[PDB]
Structure formats: structure tokens, C-alpha cells
Structure 1
Amino acid sequence: MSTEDAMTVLTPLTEKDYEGLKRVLRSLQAHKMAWPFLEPVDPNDAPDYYGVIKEPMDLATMEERVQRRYYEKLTEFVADMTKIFDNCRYYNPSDSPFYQCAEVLESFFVQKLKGFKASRSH
């Protein structure tokens, strides 16, 4: 287990950590490929969605959770974010615009998450 891995699993999120998480989340919200994920899926977008997707997630809900200091550990923040992309790929065909955006935006998140973990470790 690496130093960043130990911190990700074990280390309580501080206020300085939250400043970094806020920056990560805002960078996703500003990304060109974030348009599918800014607000909860509307049933009119896909009528069977909420009977299929058990744990919906979106960036506005994450923004609320970040402001309320919902997360105690980085793993929990990452798990909510990963739900956004996993739900999208679960429901949609791979040539859906939503699916293509999930692929790009998740790779962007992974880049930013790595930067955040490094900043936290030094």
C-alpha cells in the first residue's frame, strides 16, 4: 500500500482537503463533457431509468454533499463520483453521447483525483 493509498482510505478529510475537493468538483462541472451529469437524470430523459438505476448520482447532488461536509474519507467522495459514470455506462449503449461523455469525464476525474492525492501527500 502506497502513502497516497493509505491516506485515501484512512485519513480524515480536513478543511484544506475540502478546498481541494471543491476545486476538483468545480473543474468537472466546467468541463465540456459534463453537460449530461450536471443535474439529476429526468424521467422524461429515459422513462425506465429510476426503475433500473438503484443509486442515481449527479454533480449537483455531489456539490450539495461537499458543501454539507458529507464526506469523511476520500474513498466516499470517489465512490459517489464513480457512481455517476458507472450508472451511465450501465444504462446506455456505448455509442450514446452520454456514454462517450462518461468515458472522457471519468478519465479527466482520474487525472484530477491523482493530482489531488499528490497535493495531499506533500
Structure 2
Amino acid sequence: ELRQALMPTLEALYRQDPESLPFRQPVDPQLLGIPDYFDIVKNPMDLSTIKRKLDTGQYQEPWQYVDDVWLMFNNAWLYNRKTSRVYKFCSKLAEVFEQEIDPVMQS
């Protein structure tokens, strides 16, 4: 529905390699060895969760989807250092999103 207008913006994020790679599944702190992650990031989000919410009709307005996208970005800028790989990958996704979402959010 509105799913149809938003889906391409989400595909644009997925298509970034390798920059989407830290963002494809939920952060798995046990596996990565980062036990402080849930102390810092109170509300985790990732592409796989946004894609499920999108497919199951959980975004009723466009701002709800944009909110989860930026929750994913803001979480990563918070947790990771400015000098870090994952922080820089997040910056690239945010550039790509700005480009894709703007004309969609006009139409």
C-alpha cells in the first residue's frame, strides 16, 4: 500500500555493501562480545525488523517508518565511536536514505 512507496527506500539501504552489513540483523551482543550494548541502546532496531514491520503492515503512516530507520542510525552513532568502522558505515546509509526518502516524502 504505502508499503509500496516506502519499500524502495529500504531496498536502497540493503543494497549498500558492505555498509549495510552491520545493520542486516539485530545486534547480537553475546556473539560479538559486546555485553554493554543493551545498557547503551535501550531500543534496538535493524533492517530485518523494519522489513518485517513493513511487510506485516505495521507502518500505518510514513513518519512511523522514518522513525524506525533513524532509530537504527541514531543507535549506531550512539554506541560506536566516531573513528570506528560501524559509525562510518552508518553515516553512509544515512546519506543514501536522505536521497531516497525526500522525493518519496513529497509524493
CA distance in 2 between counterparts of 1:85 and 1:62 reads 12
The alpha-carbon deviation at position 100 of structure 1 amounts to 0.0
The residue aligned with 2:16 is: 31
Percent identical pairs in the alignment equals: 30
The residue aligned with 1:19 is: 4
Cα RMSD, aligned residues only? 1.0
Unaligned runs of 5+ in 1: 1-14
Letter in 1 for 2:7: K
Number of residues of Structure 1 aligned to a counterpart in Structure 2? 104
Classify the secondary structure of the residue corresponding to 2:81: coil
The residue aligned with 2:51 is: 63
1:76 is aligned to 2:64 = yes
- TM-score for the superposition, normalised by structure 2: 0.91
The residue aligned with 2:28 is: 42
Structure whose CA Rg is larger = 1
Q: Runs ≥4 in structure 1, deviation > 6 angstroms? A: none
Q: Which of the numbers 73, 96, 103 marks the counterpart of 1:108?
A: 96
CA distance in 2 between counterparts of 1:107 and 1:97 reads 16
The alpha-carbon deviation at position 18 of structure 1 amounts to 1.4
The alpha-carbon deviation at position 51 of structure 1 amounts to 2.0
